[PDB]
Subunit: 172 residues, 2 copies
């Protein structure tokens, strides 16, 4: 809708096809059809451009979670929503951006709010078996999310659904 969002969506597609390393005002101008000046008006620095990409993807996840959560005041329903959203294979651009986020605290902070609001807390995991049982579900969901990239046998739709169901049954 907004021009800023269109620029970001274009940049996200670009890094999957090419790379984060070659994403520049020049390559994004070609990809968007906008002039470099036009791009700079919306993203004053390359750091700001990358930050905007992280922020947009984090917001997309937050919106999907809010859309499917049955009871937002129930942590187990919020956990179910997280598991369901993670059941689909992570997209290539999203995975490459997540791997790049630790390069700067500003990028990690763009992801921090959605993580802080939806991922089960890690405080006292060492001494709280309940918190470990809940976090175990999160870890399995994360494994399903990245599966096709770290295993050499993509999951068929039926096997993926079977594992989603197996993880949902693991919720306390």
């Amino acid at each position: 809708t907004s021009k800023k969002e269109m620029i970001l969506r274009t940049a996200i597609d670009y890094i999957g096809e090419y790379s984060l390393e070659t994403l520049s005002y020049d390559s994004l101008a070609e990809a968007t059809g906008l002039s470099k000046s036009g791009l700079i008006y919306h993203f004053p620095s390359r750091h700001a451009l990358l930050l905007g990409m992280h922020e947009l993807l984090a917001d997309d996840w937050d919106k999907e979670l809010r859309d499917i959560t049955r009871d937002p005041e129930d942590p187990l329903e919020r956990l179910r929503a997280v598991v369901v959203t993670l059941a689909e294979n992570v997209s290539r651009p999203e995975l490459l951006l997540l791997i790049d986020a630790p390069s700067h605290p500003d990028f990690l902070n763009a992801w921090r709010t959605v993580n802080h609001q939806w991922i089960p807390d890690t405080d006292d995991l060492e001494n709280d078996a309940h918190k470990r049982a809940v976090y175990l579900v999160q870890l399995a969901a994360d494994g399903l999310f990245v599966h096709d990239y770290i295993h050499d046998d993509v999951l068929s739709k039926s096997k993926r659904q079977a594992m989603l169901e197996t993880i949902l049954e693991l919720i306390p």
Copy 2:
């Protein structure tokens, strides 16, 4: 002087990806990082493809050796699974993860990982119809989540928290 020069070059290339990226790894940048001439690099790796293959093979071999070293009674699938979980509790490095993501770009790279995966990682044959296979794969998925944690989440999971979760995942293995 503890390894071959060929292995040193590969370790330097892997570290180069860690400081920069896989995208900019080239004979030129590797020449600078190793202090060797392009001619010297070509002697060991005749093409960039050969260089990438060598990195996949080295990393796959490192994992296989770690698993062989810590697995007692390896003919028992459950002992292999317990050892695999322990090896995956330490977070993957960024260069290794970038290489795993890139492996499908050529069958040679996939093939480099095939032997180790086939010997140690459960297959998903008939997963939809085998409850025991799903129970084992659930453990594999949780271990994988621990392995990639710091690169799909914003927070680094501490050693003590990883230790606690490692124990929790091992408890999940059918016994």
